[PDB]
Amino acid sequence: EEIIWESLSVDVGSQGNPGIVEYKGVDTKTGEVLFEREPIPIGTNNMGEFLAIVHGLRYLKERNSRKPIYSDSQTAIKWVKDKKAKSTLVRNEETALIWKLVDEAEEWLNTHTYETPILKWQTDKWGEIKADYGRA
RNA sequence: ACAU
DNA sequence: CGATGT
Ligand SMILES: [Cl-]
Ligand SMILES: [Cl-]
Ligand SMILES: [Cl-]
Ligand SMILES: [Mg+2]
Ligand SMILES: [Mg+2]
Ligand SMILES: [Rb+]
Ligand SMILES: [Rb+]
Ligand SMILES: [Rb+]
What we know:
By secondary structure, this protein is of the alpha/beta class. The chain contains 4 helices and 5 strands, in the order E-E-E-H-E-H-H-E-H. A 5-stranded mixed beta sheet has the order 3-2-1-4-5. A hairpin with a 2-residue loop joins strand 1 (8-16) and strand 2 (19-27). The two termini are 25 Å apart.
């Protein structure tokens, strides 16, 4: 219904899917970039969407912040809720890095607590999420 | 179909 | 147009 402006927004950017994956988190109110992950040579859109949310959880917990996180990814929100990223991406030598990060993100979720609400950004009503990369 |  | 997902 209403944007919660006091929040963190996250998004993935990619060159190909599967392809080069990066992600970032921004203050929804101001657009200030709060974190950015160095590009990962091969991953999927949904792995990056998932990593971005988990990184946001870790970022907010470290700072004792109760702000919610917005993501536009139905898939990644569900994977975080389940603590399991059900990616189809083949596990091989070239995908080792993204899968290591996904595995470590799941491991963190399984060993830590948080109350952070993870909210769906309503792109159809509100336009692109504020963490968007201008690239489609 | 919906979300990317 | 293609791929990733529920
Ligand atoms: Cl990560
Ligand atoms: Cl909330
Ligand atoms: Cl959702
Ligand atoms: Mg997105
Ligand atoms: Mg985007
Ligand atoms: Rb803390
Ligand atoms: Rb984009
Ligand atoms: Rb599809």
